[PDB]
Design a protein around this nucleic acid. Structure first.
Ligand SMILES: Nc1ncnc2c1ncn2[C@@H]1O[C@H](COP(=O)(O)OP(=O)(O)O)[C@@H](O)[C@H]1O
Length: 964
RNA sequence: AAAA
């Protein structure tokens, strides 16, 4: 805190006037900043550098009667003057309106446009919006291509790439190409696709970039400006319509703590006190939140969860409550009957729908990819119409069209599998929490996050409190990619690596990254600590002893040692694992808890036993039914010592035992009333009067008879480490607090410096380059290309495989080797099912009919993985083999034989929505392999893939829109 | 294992 300001907290009005000309501070505060910057095209010669200003007027010449705010004005104005523009703002900013102008601008003078979306499901929704608006619109997806000759086109990012590599003529006729949610280029699988598309695109194409808030937004335009020789504008705004307050919910905790104030203030104590809660360690705790926020009037509330599976469970436990009124009760199934006419009688009885119908009546929504496109769309409608006050959604919901709420809850702070157990990045936080805070009902937005972690916390602060993260290119080499680049003569695989956004980052980052280090080095040098050395050897050995004594009590707490010393009435010292002391006590009874009901994994023997122990603590009096946590929820005698002081038998876990007494107190059989328990307390108090310095402890060595070589070692390193603490200015003054507080930042920055040091190592990283030589060797060895590394016939059908990434070689190998021709069309379709999707499926079929072809295409993977691994790449022999799924082979095959859709989902646990997804994509692998056989010269396998394709196509499995 |  140096120079900063503070908004008016709750409600205020700053101005007033009378009768002629006022000054408007009216009903908005405080959302302020906007930004406009322009990237410029590089100059060819020294001889001439033109300096070209363009500052476009606020309100354009013709607004087409459309409604526009000051922000979207210059976004439109940039397109109006016909130049590329980047709009980076929250999904609340209304970015869609500028996309409709760009198309309308082109349609006005009658030329062609391409609209694109990260996701095909969202592409279809925007299509029917565009078609019903303009009418000259048509969509090309993989599955369905409708009206391709239309001026405006809605297509998958996958399709847009496939036409460029194949050099479609339609790209010569396209003026503008609109990319939406481009900040999702981060995706480790399909994010590389966005870069491949952009770089290869014609230089005369004008661009529109619709993105969330990103720090490097200007850096992105530089990269577009340099490779395309264009002037690319940047329109960026940080404003959001509603203030945001952040509450932390500790795991197992009984409440929420406010970490971030509405004005941005970060509470350190709430953060620290929250961490005290998590040392006390399937949580139903979400059912509690949704319960009270109904009564606290926080609605609607969007609960974000990153798994399809556990997402429905948190909806199930909350299904025991009903938040809807009778007028809302019958309104949801009155609007539910419209989609029945759009469905078949067999499909209207579908199992998924019969579950959700009573659920929506209770006012509980659910949104994810495992849902039917018609069913999830009604749920999307019902939310923004206000008939659903509680929604359990996945990350995809935050990517889609604006559908804001009053509350946003983060259930999990860790993120996905692909390369890392990855803490939640800042960009995802801004995007999801941006859903909170609608216009006129919210004084404030409410954001709740549950926090537990798997190594060390300092990260946990950095997510919300710290800075944002760079938008990192996920660009990486691929088999399908290197062949497509080696395919066209005009371009080499090295050409794309040059213009890839990852290279553009590193080149411009490193000279600046050098200044990042020297500025960091000044601060740690600018801090001057008296006796800079001795302290490093105090804090150094401070964390050394505090850590190694934890290893001593841990062995003692283990039943191997302490258990034999458990006797009724033995004096016991109880201190919670968090470090809070419940005071002394006396052992009443010890019992091992055996065989819990089901859910939680069986107990480790450290926490296994349960010790009933008499303590003088107080707090919420009841909890005799005791949570599996360490203790009933109490409060030690810091609290009300008047309202309660009672010696009470407390069922403490075994890890709460830090010491044992030397002698035991005689105990009766029953402590029930206050009399029976208070009498034992005086028996304890008597011991305290005779032992002022402390109560004698059983010596772990001699008294408890622990001779272990590992125990002796730890205990010997305990003694000598204690002696080092006395050799420092520990005694005769405790000023170490001021030293540690100043020295703490020195180590934080020092650790922060080492990262910036290793940051340069990753800027100069050769991973892309070294992979290419190693990857092109297996292309030569497997026979895909020659010794001169020139394309061969096999590589021409491998460039035709798109929809499937990673089996591109396997599929190319099997097809060229004359495999699918020895089979039947139904068999050909069920075999290609293994490649299409990686979601787990449970059914039991080892049936030898489909096991024979599966084992063969599986063995071929081992052949591929054999030479590819010793080529100095990294792939395991087992991992790649198992990347194909046999659990769905029975399922898809049944649909091809003309069995009803309803029975199909009864064979497996596959989502009815996910089943649609893997079919439509399987459908496209067929259409792509139809072209693959067409290049090979074998036209019998073309019809083979076409006759198979015809059996996956029917009336009700094709449902999007029917217009023109 | 989330998203296409
Ligand atoms: N000038 C404006 N100020 C505030 N809200 C607006 C404005 N224009 C549109 N909106 C509303 O804000 C929401 C965001 O619009 P939209 O463009 O659909 O979101 P996205 O940017 O995700 O496409 C819309 O529901 C719209 O009604």
């Amino acid at each position: 805190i140096m120079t900063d300001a503070f908004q008016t907290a709750e409600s205020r009005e700053v101005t007033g006037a009378q009768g002629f000309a006022p000054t408007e501070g009216e009903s908005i505060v405080l959302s302020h900043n906007i930004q406009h910057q322009v990237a410029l095209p590089p100059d060819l010669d020294y001889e001439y550098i033109p300096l070209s200003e363009h500052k476009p007027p606020a309100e354009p010449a013709r607004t087409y009667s459309f409604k526009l705010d000051p922000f979207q004005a210059l976004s439109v104005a940039s397109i109006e003057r016909e130049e590329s523009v980047l709009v980076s703002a929250h999904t609340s900013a209304g970015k869609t309106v500028v996309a409709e102008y760009a198309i309308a601008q082109c349609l006005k003078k009658n030329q062609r446009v391409i609209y694109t979306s990260p996701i095909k499901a969202l592409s279809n929704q925007k299509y029917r919006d565009f078609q019903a608006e303009f009418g000259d619109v048509g969509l090309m997806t993989g599955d369905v291509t409708i009206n391709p000759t239309a001026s405006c086109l809605v297509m998958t990012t996958e399709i847009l790439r496939s036409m460029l590599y194949r050099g479609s003529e339609i790209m010569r006729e396209v003026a503008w190409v609109v990319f939406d949610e481009i900040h999702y280029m981060r995706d480790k699988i399909r994010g590389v696709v966005w870069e491949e598309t952009i770089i290869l695109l014609p230089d005369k194409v004008r661009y529109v970039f619709l993105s969330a808030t990103i720090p490097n937004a200007f850096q992105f335009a530089e990269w577009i400006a340099k490779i395309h020789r264009q002037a690319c504008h940047v329109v960026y705004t940080d404003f959001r319509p509603t203030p945001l307050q952040n509450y932390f919910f500790p795991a197992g905790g009984k409440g929420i703590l406010l970490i971030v104030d509405e004005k941005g203030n970060f509470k350190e104590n709430n953060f620290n006190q929250a961490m005290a809660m998590i040392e006390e360690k399937e949580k139903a705790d979400i059912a509690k939140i949704i319960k009270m926020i109904l009564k606290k009037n926080f609605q609607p509330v969007i609960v974000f969860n990153f798994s399809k599976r556990e997402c429905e469970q948190m909806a199930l436990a909350s299904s025991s409550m009903k938040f809807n009124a009778p007028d809302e009760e019958n309104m949801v199934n009155k609007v539910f009957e419209n989609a029945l006419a759009s469905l078949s009688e067999d499909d209207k009885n579908l199992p998924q729908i019969s579950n959700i119908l009573p659920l929506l009546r209770k006012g509980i929504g659910v949104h994810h990819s495992g849902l039917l496109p018609i069913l999830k769309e009604t749920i999307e409608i019902l939310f923004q119409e206000g008939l659903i006050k509680v929604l359990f959604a996945t990350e995809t919901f935050s990517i889609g069209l604006n559908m804001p709420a009053r509350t946003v809850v983060f259930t999990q702070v860790t993120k996905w599998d692909g390369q890392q157990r990855r803490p939640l990045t800042s960009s995802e936080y801004i995007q999801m929490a941006g859903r909170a805070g609608r216009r006129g009902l919210d004084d404030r937005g409410i954001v709740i996050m549950m926090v537990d972690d798997k190594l060390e916390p300092e990260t946990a602060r950095a997510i919300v409190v710290g800075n944002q993260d760079k938008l990192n290119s996920a660009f990486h080499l691929g088999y399908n990619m290197v062949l497509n680049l080696l395919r066209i003569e005009a371009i080499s695989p090295e050409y794309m690596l040059e213009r890839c956004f990852f290279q553009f980052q590193n080149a411009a980052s490193v000279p600046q990254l050098e200044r990042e280090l020297i500025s960091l080095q000044q601060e740690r040098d600018a801090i001057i600590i008296p006796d800079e050395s001795i302290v490093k050897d105090y804090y150094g050995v401070r964390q050394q002893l505090e850590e190694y004594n934890k290893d001593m009590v841990f062995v003692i707490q283990h039943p191997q040692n302490c258990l034999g010393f458990f006797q009724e009435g033995r004096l016991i010292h109880i201190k919670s694992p968090s470090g809070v002391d419940y005071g002394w006590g006396v052992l009443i009874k010890h019992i091992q808890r055996q065989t819990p009901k089901n859910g939680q994994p069986p107990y480790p023997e450290q926490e296994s036993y349960v010790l009933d122990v008499l303590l003088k603590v107080s707090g919420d009096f009841n909890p005799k039914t005791r949570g599996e946590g360490p203790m009933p929820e109490g409060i030690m005698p810091a609290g009300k010592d008047s309202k309660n002081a009672r010696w009470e038998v407390v069922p403490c876990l075994l890890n709460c035992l830090r010491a044992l007494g030397q002698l035991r107190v005689f105990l009766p059989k029953r402590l029930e009333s206050a009399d029976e328990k208070d009498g034992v307390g005086k028996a304890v108090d008597e011991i305290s009067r005779r032992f002022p310095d402390g109560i004698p402890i059983l010596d772990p060595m001699e008294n408890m008879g622990i001779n272990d070589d590992s125990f002796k070692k730890l205990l010997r390193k305990i003694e000598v480490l204690e002696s080092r603490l006395v050799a420092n200015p520990l005694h005769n003054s405790p000023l170490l607090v001021e030293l540690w507080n100043q020295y703490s930042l020195k180590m934080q920055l020092g650790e922060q410096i080492k990262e910036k040091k290793k940051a340069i190592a990753r800027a100069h990283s050769v991973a892309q380059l070294d992979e290419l030589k190693s990857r092109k060797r297996v292309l030569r060895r497997l026979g895909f290309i020659n010794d001169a590394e020139v394309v061969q016939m096999k590589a021409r059908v491998a460039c035709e495989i798109s929809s499937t990434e990673g089996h591109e070689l396997l599929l190319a190998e099997l097809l060229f080797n004359r495999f699918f021709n020895e089979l039947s069309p139904e068999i050909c379709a069920c075999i290609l099912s293994c490649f299409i999707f990686d979601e787990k499926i449970e059914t039991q079929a080892l049936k030898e009919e489909l096991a024979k072809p599966f084992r063969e295409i599986q063995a071929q993977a081992r052949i591929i993985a054999k030479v590819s691994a010793e080529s100095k790449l990294d792939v395991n022999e087992d991992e790649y083999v198992q990347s194909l799924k046999w659990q769905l082979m029975e399922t898809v095959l049944a649909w091809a034989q003309g069995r009803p859709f309803s029975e199909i989902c009864k064979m497996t646990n596959v989502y009815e929505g996910s089943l649609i997804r893997l079919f439509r994509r399987l459908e496209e692998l067929l259409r792509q392999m139809a072209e693959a056989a067409r290049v090979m010269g074998s036209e019998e396998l073309k019809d083979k893939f076409e006759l198979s394709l015809s059996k996956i196509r029917r009336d009700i499995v094709s449902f999007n829109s029917l217009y023109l």
